[model samples]
Target: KKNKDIRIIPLGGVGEIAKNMYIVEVDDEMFMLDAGLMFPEDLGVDIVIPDIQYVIENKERLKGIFLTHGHEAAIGAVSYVLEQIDAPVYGSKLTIALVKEAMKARNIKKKVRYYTVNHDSIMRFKNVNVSFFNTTHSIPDSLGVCIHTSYGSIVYTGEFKFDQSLHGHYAPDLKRMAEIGDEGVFALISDSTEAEKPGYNTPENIIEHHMYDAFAKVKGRLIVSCYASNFVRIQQVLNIASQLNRKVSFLGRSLESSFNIARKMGYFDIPKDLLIPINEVENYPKNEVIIIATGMQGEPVEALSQMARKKHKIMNIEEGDSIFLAITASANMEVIIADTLNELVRAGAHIIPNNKKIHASSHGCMEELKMMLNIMKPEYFVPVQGEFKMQIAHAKLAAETGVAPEKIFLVEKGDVISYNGKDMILNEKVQSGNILI
Candidate 1:
C-alpha cells in the first residue's frame, strides 16, 4: 500500500500564548488538537481564537476535535469553532464535562460526544486512531494524545504537569508513553508554556501546608485567591476551612462556573452541609473561615481587585485580614497587583504573595520537561502552547535530550511541516484551522 500523506499546521499558539490550534492530516482525515482563547486587557480584545473557516469549509474530511485537557488556552475558544463545524469532541471525563458546560453557556444545544480517555483505551475514527496517556496537572484526568497514522504516530501533550509527590496516583504514564515511543513516533507537539524553567514544577500538595500556615497565623478574615479553574486547589482550600470548622465562600464568575461543573460532575464532591453562600461569609466566625475568590490575573472587573478598591458590597478586606494571590502574575499583571496592592494597603488588606510561601503554575519545569523527553524519546519535536521563544527553548531541550537535531521540527503559524521518514520537512499548507472547522 502507498504511504498516506501527513502534514502539520499550527493556527495559533505557535507564536505566543493562548489559542492553541494544530492541524494533522493523514490522507484525507484531519484532526485538531485545541481551540483555545487568549484575553488581552490593553488591546481591548475580549477573546482571540484561531479562525477555522478553512477547516470548517472542509468538514467532511475532519475526523473529530480531540482535546487533551480543559484550559481556556486549550479549549476556551472551541465553542466558536464548533459553531462552524459540527465534529464530535473527545477528551477525559472532567475535561469534557467542563467543555460541555462551557458549550451550553454559549447556547450550543447540539450534543457533542464526550469520551473519557484513559491510558488503556484506544479510540479509532476512520484511518486515525487516538490513545490518551493520563498525565498529572492541577486539574484532573489530563493527557498527552497519541494519534496513529499510516506513516507514524503524532503526540500532543495537552497542558500537562509532573507532580509525583502530590499526584503520585496519576503520575505521567511513562510506561505507556515509552511503549508508544518504541512503537514509533513521527512528530511530538508538546507544551511550551512552562518548558524553559530550570527545575521541577511545584506540586499541588504543597498548598495544604501553605493554607494551614496562613490559617494559623491570621487572626481575622482570610481570603485565598487562585486560578478559578484549579478545582483541585479549591477543594484543598475547602478542606482546610472544613478542618478549621470554618465556613467557605467563593467569588468570581469563572471560579463559580468551574466549581458548579466540578460538583455536577462529581469531581468536587463538596459536602452539602458545608455549603455557605458568599452573601453569608461574614456570618461565620472571623479567622476561622476561608473565602476562595478570583482576580488573580489583575483583571479590573474581577471580584478581588474590585473589592480592593472598596467597590464590592458583599466582601471587604477589613483590618487584620490576609489576602493571598494564589495565582501567578503574567508579568503584565505585576503593575496591576502593585497598583491594586497600593490601594489595598490603604484598605488594610495584607497581601500574601510578598511574604508568604504560596504555590502556582500548572505547567512542568525544565527537569520535568527533560524527564518527559528522556522517557518518550520521540522522533521529532513541535512545541505548542507558548510564545515562540519558549517553544524554541523546548525544541532545543528536546534536541539535547535524545531526539536528533535533524528530527527537531520547529514551526510557526501558517507553516507546514511533515514527519514521515528520517526527518521532518516542510510540507504544503492546507490553510487548516486547529478545530473541526
Candidate 2:
C-alpha cells in the first residue's frame, strides 16, 4: 500500500501580507490555519476576504478553523467564512471573545461553535493531533500551533517575538517549542513580516519606560493613538497613566470594546478607578488626563483623525495638547498619517516622535526568526504572513540556520506543497484570491 501524503496549500497570506488562510490535508482529514481579512486598497471596498471557493468545495473535509491570535489579519474573516460554510473555530480565550464581538458588530448571527484553547490544550483528530504553545505578540492570548502527523509535526508560529521578559500568556513557551522540535518536525510555516530587519524585536516591557519618558514631558492632556486589538500596548499605556496619576479615557468605540473585554478577562492589571468615561473627560484637568484612541492607521473616521480635523464632537485638538502616535503605520497608510499629522500640527498640538522607541512591533525580526528556525529544526520550511520579498529573505535565513536550500519552499497564494511521507514537492495551484466586501 502507498503511504498517504500530507498536502499544504496556502489559499492566501503568502504573496501578500494579510488575509491569511491556509489548508493542511492528511488522508481524509483537513483543517485551516486562519481565516483573515485584509484592509481594502480600493475606495469603496470595505474589506478583502479570501476567495474560499476551494474551501466551499471541500467544506466537508474541513474539520476546524484554528486561529493564532485576535489580530485583524488573523481572525478577521471568521464571520464571512462561516457564512459560506460552517466549521468549528478554535482559538485562545481572548481571540474567541474578539471574534464573537466582530461577528456581533457585523450582525452575523451564525451559531458556529467556538472552542477556547490554552497553551496545554490538545485536540485529537483522525489524522493529526493539534496543540498550541504561547507566543508573545501585540495581543493577549496569542498562540503558535503544532499539528502532529504520522510523517512528523508541522509547526505554525503565528506573528510573534521572543520576548523572554514577559510572563503568563504574553510569553512564548520556549521549552515546549524545543520539546516539539525533539519529536521531529516535517514542515515549519512561520511569520516572515520582519525577516528583513536585523536583530530581535523589542520586548514589550521596554516600551513602557519609553512611553513614560514621553508622557512625563507633556504638560497638558495627552492623546495616544494605538490599534484597538493591541492589548499589550494598551496595558503599557494604562500602566504609565496610572503611575503618572492621570485619569484615562478611551476615545474610540472599538478601543472601548476591546478595553472592556480585556479588563473583564483579567488581562489588564491596572487600578479600577483609573478609568474615566469619555463623557467625563472634560471634567478632569487637562494635565491629569490621558486619552487613548483608535486611528493609529490615520483612518478618516477614527477618533484621532476626527480630532485632527477638529470635527470630533467630544474633543478637539487643543494648543497645549500632546499627541503620541503609539503605532507604526501599515503599508499604504503613510500618506493619511502625514496628512493627519499636518492637521494636528496646524492646530498647535505637539506630536511626539514615535521613532524614538515609543512603539515596539509585535513581529519578530531576523534574529528571532532564525531563533525559531533553530528551535523547530524542521525537515521542510515555508515562510508565511509576509510579502514575496520577505518570504525570500526568510527562506535565506532558514538556509543560514541549517535548513537545506532545496527544502525551503517559496510559495504564494493558491500554491500547493505535497509530502508523500518522504519527498516534499510543489504540486499544483488551487483557486484563491481576494473577495472584496
Candidate 3:
C-alpha cells in the first residue's frame, strides 16, 4: 500500500501571538492541535478565535482536537470550536478541567465529548496514532503531543521550558521525548514566544526565592497580581504566605475559581487555615494578609484594576500596601499596565515590578529551542505561538541545529506544509484568519 501524504496547516497562532489552532491531515482524516483564543486590541472586541470555516467544511474528517495545556492561548477557544464541529476533545486532567470551567463560565450548553488523557495514554486511528508527554509550563498537566503516521512522527512541543527541579505533573518527560526523536520525526512544531530570549528560561524555583524575599520584607499588606491560570506561581505564593504566617485571600472571581479547582484536585499543599474569605480580610491585621489577584494585564474589570481605581465592591487599596506585579506584560498591554502602576503609586502602594525576578516565563528560550531541535532532529521545522519575528528567529535556530534551511518553514496562518512519502513542500494554502467574538 502506498503511504498517504501528511499535511500541516496553521489556522491561527502564526504571524501573531495567540488564537493557536493547527490541523494535521493524514489521508482523509484530520486532527487539531490546539484551539486557543487571542485578546484583541480592537475596540469592543472581547476575544479573537480562529476562523473555523475549514473545520466546519470538513467536520466529519476531524478525528479529535488535542490540547497542549490549559492556557487561553492553548484551549481558550475549545468551546467556540465545539460549537461548529462535533469532534472529541482530548487533554490532560487540569486542561480538561479548565475547558469545562470555560464552557460553564460562558454558559454554553454544548453537549460535547471530553476525554481526559495523561502521559501514558494513546489514541489510535486507522492511519494515525496520538500520544502525549508531560512538559513543564506555568500550569500543571501540560503536554507535548506526538502524532504518528506512515511517513514519520509529527511532534508538537507546546509551550515549555526545561526545569530540572520540577516534579510530579509539572516535570518534563525527557526520556519519552528522546524516544520519539529516535523513532524519526518528520516535522517539528515548537513554541517561539521566547525564541529571541537568550539562555534557558528562569526556573519556577528561583521565583520562589524572590517571592520569599518580598513576603518577608513587606510589613504592610501584600498584593500580588498574576494570571489566574498560573497555578505553579500561585502555589509558590501560597507556600510563602503559609511560611510567613499570613492569611491568603484571593480577590478575583477567576482567581477564586482556579484556586478552588486546583485545591480540589490536590494540586496545592497549603494548610486550610491559611485561607480566608475576601469579606473577612479586614478582620486580620494588614501586615498578616496576602491578596493574590488578577489583572496583571491591567484589564479594566479585573480585581487589581478595580482596586487600583478604588472601585472594588469588597476590597480597596490601602495605604502602606505592597503590590507585586508577578507577570510580564503581554504585547499591547504595557500602556494599560503603566496606567495601573501610576494609579497604584498614587494610592501610596509600593510597587514591585515583574523584572524584580519574582516571576519566570513559562515558554522555552533560545538555547532551549535549539536543544529541542537537536533532540528531535526533525526533517522539517515550523515555529508556532509567537509573532512573525519570533518565528523567524526560531527558524534560524532550527537551521543552526542542522535542519536544512529550505526545509524550515516561516509561514503564516493559511500556508500549508505537506509531506509526501519522501519530501516536504509548502505549495498550498487554506482558508485561515481570525473571528472576533
Write the residue-wise lDDT of candidate 3 on 299-374 in tens digits. 4325566787798886889878999877776556766677788888888889865554332688888998888899
- TM-scores for every candidate against the unseen true structure: 0.91, 0.95, 0.94
Candidate 2: deviation at residue 94, Å?
1.4
lDDT of 2 by residue, 216-253 (tens): 99999898887776777788888899889998888743
Clashing pairs in 2: none
Model 1: per-residue lDDT, tens digit, 90-158?
777767888887888888797666666767888877777888788777777677888887566788887
TM-score, candidate 3, is 0.94
Q: What is the C-alpha lDDT of each candidate?
A: 0.73, 0.84, 0.83
- Candidate 3: C-alpha lDDT: 0.83
Model 1 misplaced stretches (Cα beyond 4 Å): 41-45, 111-114, 168-171, 252-255, 269-272, 295-297, 300-302, 353-359, 420-423, 427-437
Q: How much does each candidate deviate from the true structure in C-alpha RMSD?
A: 3.0, 2.1, 2.1
Judged by lDDT relative to the true structure, which candidate is superior, 1 or 2? 2
**Candidate 2 TM-score over all chains jointly:** 0.95
